[PDB]
Amino acid sequence: ANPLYQKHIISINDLSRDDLNLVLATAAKLKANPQPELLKHKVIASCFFEASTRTRLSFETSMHRLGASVVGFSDSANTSLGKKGETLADTISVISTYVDAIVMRHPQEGAARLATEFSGNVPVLNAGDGSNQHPTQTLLDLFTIQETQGRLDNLHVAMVGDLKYGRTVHSLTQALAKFDGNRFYFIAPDALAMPQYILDMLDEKGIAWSLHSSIEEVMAEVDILYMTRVQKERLDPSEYANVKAQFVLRASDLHNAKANMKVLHPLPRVDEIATDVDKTPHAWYFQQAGNGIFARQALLALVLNRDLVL
């Protein structure tokens, strides 16, 4: 069947270079030649035990542009499952009798992998599990990098912000390290630096990386600038405010950038990317959010349909 057919999609660590290319290949075809009744008669469950409006709506719109039906929930201060009494394991054992696939987001790490041991032959797709994984965000980031740069290797990629805790930057570095020749520049406040394990991995692969202090230091050699929001709660108000003349982005800073350089951000962006950046050609975070539809369509199509010939 296709290699991912009826497979669980829990961690980037579990998908090979080739699995990532198969998804990106499919998603470029679903973008080009849409197939609206592909999952006709499927019911997907959207179990968001942790609310996330933006990720929830992108998944559900993905389920619906391929014709699937949707049942599910979100839970900020509401609706009963998991309770305290009800285990996750029994929620899943019950729900995997109703549906054909489960997309779930949960606050404790590995909640998705636990689900896998209780869903029977029902595939579960991880939409976030605490501070561990978020594969469908890495899948759309790579689609946007491939779609803008034309390739996924020999890229000069800069990552900026909270590198210690952005789960998306941890994932995107493992993923871009399955391809060849990428150079990484990590511009972070040293209180929020890339953890030694990403770095120790990068060294065994022989991947080149460097740590910088301002985007201004690398603006010129860079192809992707991946901005991350810096999280004030893990900072002191006064620490947050005293870093240099910051690590926020304004169009003045872009006068230097290459013609094909794009700025990516998983969103929300509160203040690290100013409104004037939005009008330059380098701004690509909204387009990045729309490619989420095509990456998540692709993963759903490959998981639920055996042989997909589009």
Partner: protein
């Protein structure tokens, strides 16, 4: 059956002898690997005289042959220990533990937000890097910790 004694107790009729347990590890190995949940006669020697370690523990489980990977589950706690397999008053086999690739059940993920705490799943860790020193990665949360940290709570 033959002489026993206690400075180095003697001869069971077929079964396993885990000799050269460090010291105070014997009861841990009994508790953790629940070796006691058997109707067979077990004999155990705690804090015993020995050549090099000086004082050691030993466990003799008759009629059970625990092997190949059971012996490896022991490596984190009793790495220098020998597992003599006995048939008819003769040691027809001596094993030593080697580091396994998976240690199930016995450990506790130190990460408090791990889902494994609250649920009917067994703990499981991928193991790596022999004797310069061991990292364990949770199956579930995929956090890697130093074995000495998992081995405290």
């Amino acid at each position: 059956m033959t002489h026993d004694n206690k400075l180095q107790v003697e001869a069971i009729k077929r079964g396993t002898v885990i000799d050269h347990i460090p010291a105070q590890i014997g009861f841990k190995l009994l508790s953790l690997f629940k070796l006691t949940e058997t109707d067979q006669r077990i004999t155990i020697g705690l804090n015993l005289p020995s050549g090099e370690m000086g004082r050691k523990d030993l466990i003799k489980i008759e009629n059970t042959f625990l092997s190949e990977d059971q012996v490896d589950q022991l490596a984190l706690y009793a790495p220098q220990a020998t597992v003599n397999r006995i048939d008819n008053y003769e040691v027809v086999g001596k094993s030593r533990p080697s580091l396994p690739e998976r240690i199930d059940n016995v450990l506790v993920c130190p990460n408090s937000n791990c889902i494994s705490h609250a649920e009917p799943v067994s703990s499981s860790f991928a193991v790596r890097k022999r004797a310069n020193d061991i990292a364990l990665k949770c199956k579930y949360c995929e956090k890697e910790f130093s074995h000495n940290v998992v081995l405290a709570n």
